[PDB]
Structure 1
């Protein structure tokens, strides 16, 4: 199972994801990126069935970049979330469903920061923090315990590291490194990869 997490502060969204691609016994890639830049202030974090993740998310990415090319301005992260939800919900009952779990992170200039949970059925939920994978079961209670809405991003990285230390302590799969990015008014920033 593959792990995503987002944390939405006052003026930023902190997202992390496990950096592992596996084939059922072996970690075939230990520097694998699950984050997809939709536009300059939108990340789509995708886990799910193999193949569906990259195909669906590169579909969403080319249509959001095509919106920016057609229009001279970007989609808002709300509009990107509803577009992603709409394509996933339309493909739900088609012949070719996408079994993908999604965190859409985003910073809007007017709306502020925004995080969106999305399960594989395409239920969209705006959330102050959210996570996928089986590690979400271990980490969301720590996030319920320690998150306040006025969290600084330094305390957000410390809380993220508490979640990842819980995954090292208690979770059964080896998830050694975590790609950590942050979105704010200055765009998407690669933070340091939390390693163990």
Structure 2
């Protein structure tokens, strides 16, 4: 009957690879570039909008950076709708942890929950995996600031600076070249902006094609999503653009 139409998403290749996982990674390779950099006093997320038009309302547009929690945010690379499904689930899990323990959820717990959801989609159900890669930028009182990365394979890793999406190899090479363990948050902003401007397939890096976020620090952290005017200001300040 229906056996003739099953794509069998959760099967191994003769080489020992998950077909749909590799294909989702290839899909995300064509998506926008998102870069996270964790300095000693903050975390910076910078993403490039693949969808660009002169009539695109960028004021109310959020296609790359989403707030999971007052302490945790995510940069997205890939299918926006699958990412939003996973983001809704992550927000629900974070609030469940908050209701259970009366303490904000640690970053790795949420990251592992999302990664296990992704993994379960790659081992059973016969359903397609989520074509989304996440860069988590979070803060908690245990590990301080934290940068994580998760892919459709269900694997999650921790990074000082990381990039997902298009041209991740050149971005990672540039970061390894210019990253320093002692650098501050503004240095991370400059490094992320320069890496994006040097790894963008577009002509130039402008405010309309950028989303920016900073998790900074009292005993309180501030999660600031940059507005288009703030993005243009930081672009003209870091020397990438002229005004």
TM-score in terms of structure 2 length? 0.70
1:167 equivalenced with 2:205 (yes/no): no
Aligned alpha-carbon RMSD (Å): 2.4
Structure 1 unaligned residues grouped into runs of 5+: none
Instruction: State the partner residue of 2:93.
Output: 63
Relative to structure 1, is the Cα distance of residues 161 and 120 closer, same or farther in structure 2, using a 3 angstrom cutoff?
Answer: same
- Distance apart, 1:28 and its partner CA: 7.9
In 1: Cα distance, 2:215 partner to 2:72 partner: 8
Distance (Å, rounded) in 1 between the aligned partners of 2:55 and 2:137: 27
TM-score in terms of structure 1 length:
0.85
**Partner residue of 1:112?**
144
Equivalent of 1:41, from 49, 71, 81?
A: 71
Matched, 1:101 2:136: no
Structure exhibiting the larger radius of gyration computed from Cα positions: 2
Tell me how far 1:167 sits from its aligned partner. 3.2
Aligned pair count? 191
In structure 2, stretches of 5+ residues that fail to align are 1-30, 236-240
Measured after TM superposition, the shift of residue 175 of structure 1 is 6.1
Q: Hey, what does 1:73 align to over in structure 2?
A: 103
Contact 1:52 1:99 in 2 (8 A): yes
Answer 1 or 2: which has greater strand percent: 1
Question: Residues 29, 140 of structure 1: CA spacing in aligned structure 2 closer, same or farther, 3 A cutoff?
Answer: farther
